[PDB]
Amino acid sequence: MRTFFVGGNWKANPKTVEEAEKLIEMLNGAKVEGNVEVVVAAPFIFLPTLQQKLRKDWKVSAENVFTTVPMIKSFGIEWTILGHSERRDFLAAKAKFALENGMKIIYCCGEHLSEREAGKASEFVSAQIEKMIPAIPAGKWDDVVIAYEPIWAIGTGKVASTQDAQEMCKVIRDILAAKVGADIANKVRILYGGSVKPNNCNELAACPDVDGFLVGGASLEPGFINIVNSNVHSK
Amino acid sequence: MRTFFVGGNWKANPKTVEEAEKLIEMLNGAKVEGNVEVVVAAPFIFLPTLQQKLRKDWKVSAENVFTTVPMIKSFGIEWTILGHSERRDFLAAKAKFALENGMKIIYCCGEHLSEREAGKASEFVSAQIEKMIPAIPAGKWDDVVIAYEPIWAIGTGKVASTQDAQEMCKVIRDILAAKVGADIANKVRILYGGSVKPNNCNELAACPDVDGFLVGGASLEPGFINIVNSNVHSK
Numbered sequence: 001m002r003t004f005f006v007g008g009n010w011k012a013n014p015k016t017v018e019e020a021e022k023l024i025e026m027l028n029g030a031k032v033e034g035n036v037e038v039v040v041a042a043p044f045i046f047l048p049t050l051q052q053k054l055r056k057d058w059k060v061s062a063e064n065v066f067t068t069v070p071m072i073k074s075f076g077i078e079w080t081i082l083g084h085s086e087r088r089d090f091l092a093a094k095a096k097f098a099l100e101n102g103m104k105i106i107y108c109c110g111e112h113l114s115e116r117e118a119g120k121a122s123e124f125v126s127a128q129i130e131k132m133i134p135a136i137p138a139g140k141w142d143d144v145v146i147a148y149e150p151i152w153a154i155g156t157g158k159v160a161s162t163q164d165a166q167e168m169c170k171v172i173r174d175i176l177a178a179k180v181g182a183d184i185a186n187k188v189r190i191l192y193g194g195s196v197k198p199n200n201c202n203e204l205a206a207c208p209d210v211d212g213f214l215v216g217g218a219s220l221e222p223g224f225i226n227i228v229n230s231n232v233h234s235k
Numbered sequence: 236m237r238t239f240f241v242g243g244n245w246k247a248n249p250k251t252v253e254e255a256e257k258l259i260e261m262l263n264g265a266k267v268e269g270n271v272e273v274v275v276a277a278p279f280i281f282l283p284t285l286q287q288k289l290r291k292d293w294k295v296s297a298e299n300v301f302t303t304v305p306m307i308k309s310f311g312i313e314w315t316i317l318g319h320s321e322r323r324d325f326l327a328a329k330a331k332f333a334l335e336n337g338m339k340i341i342y343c344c345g346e347h348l349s350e351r352e353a354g355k356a357s358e359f360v361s362a363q364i365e366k367m368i369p370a371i372p373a374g375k376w377d378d379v380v381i382a383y384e385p386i387w388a389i390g391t392g393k394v395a396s397t398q399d400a401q402e403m404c405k406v407i408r409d410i411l412a413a414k415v416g417a418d419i420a421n422k423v424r425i426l427y428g429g430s431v432k433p434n435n436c437n438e439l440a441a442c443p444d445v446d447g448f449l450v451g452g453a454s455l456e457p458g459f460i461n462i463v464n465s466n467v468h469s470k
């Protein structure tokens with residue numbers, strides 16, 4: 001049922017409009033296998049370039065928005081990321097706002113090392129999602145994707161396993177089922193936003209509650225297409 | 236000696252790329268009188284449009300930068316604003332950085348209502364400038380403009396007088412003279428960044444230590460050209 005979803009988040013890269021154009025030419029020639037929804041998020045100064053030049057079967061995303069949405073929409077940009085850990089290091093209201101204004105969102109959550117070490121990851125993440133849930137207007141869940149970022153495994157010297165991804169995506173789906181029902185839970189894509197590379201994307205994709213990825217550094221490399229194509233391993 | 240300087244800061248406006256293009260067409264037809272250096276700062280998503288379409292005798296500025304500079308430079312953008320009150324509501328280091336990386340900066344300062352009411356405006360502003368001063372590399376003062384923002388008069392129900400502008404720009408020039416010498420003090424443009432409109436720009440321009448303006452809302456209106464042309468009243 002759920003279409004696999006892969007978002008490439010360039011973060012604050014590349015350093016120049018010439019490199020961005022070379023990256024776009026590479027993406028435009030990529031052969032996508034299977035069935036997958038691809039979105040690419042880029043720095044604001046590069047959005048008009050992406051929007052003009054990126055293959056039209058993929059969509060462009062902002063990496064964040066402000067309390068602005070009309071400017072981005074005036075370029076024809078439909079998506080934004082919200083809540084990404086770098087920004088985090090309010091949100092339910094900003095989700096409500098972006099959605100009321102016709103945006104599709106990638107809503108990020110995830111716990112830090114102390115909560116993970118304390119055995120409280122599931123509690124901490126559940127609470128984040130329980131706060132998001134009232135802020136989604138009726139009829140807007142089709143326009144929501146949730147990304148789990150294991151912030152505890154980013155720059156800490158700790159690594160996340162494939163089972164950690166699966167467990168945390170299941171936690172999220174279960175809290176959706178508990179609070180807004182099985183139909184919404186069954187349709188919402190829940191992404192893994194930890195370190196995703198060509199060497200682990202296929203095993204992660206196969207996890208039953210992992211519907212895709214919010215990709216960091218590999219989104220600037222030819223390996224992105226391997227990650228996009230890992231959808232063929234997700235059932 | 237010092238060339239009058241007017242920076243138009245669009246802030247988070249206009250709401251759409253179509254309106255930005257209409258504003259640029261208006262600016263491109265404007266007849267500038269006298270001698271004046273004009274810079275226009277715009278949201279990041281609109282910088283490539285400004286850079287392509289704005290009259291080449293004016294320059295485009297970023298409204299802020301991050302600890303990025305290469306991206307902006309790759310479009311050929313030479314300026315940025317730093318320290319603007321909205322952003323404020325670290326900096327000396329970011330000034331050093333932007334300058335070392337070839338940027339020209341508009342460095343903002345200014346005190347809040349409590350300091351103004353307490354009689355401490357001059358002390359407060361002086362301290363801000365004394366912090367900026369060590370962070371300017373030797374030989375980079377030609378690439379620095381300072382803007383005084385009377386933050387105490389923005390959204391507080393208090394208004395600033397022409398004499399308040401003059402007094403506060405003089406304070407800044409005096410601290411430059413005291414700390415880095417009369418030659419640098421005599422050449423640095425010090426701008427007034429309070430409410431500047433066609434009805435008060437000429438009287439402000441005539442103030443001896445006011446070298447120009449960092450314009451807010453009037454920068455989106457045909458009145459901007461009146462403010463640019465107030466340079467003929469500055470001696």
Ligand code: NA
Nearest residue numbers: 205207210234
């Ligand atoms: Na899966």
Ligand code: NA
Nearest residue numbers: 440442445469
């Ligand atoms: Na003057």
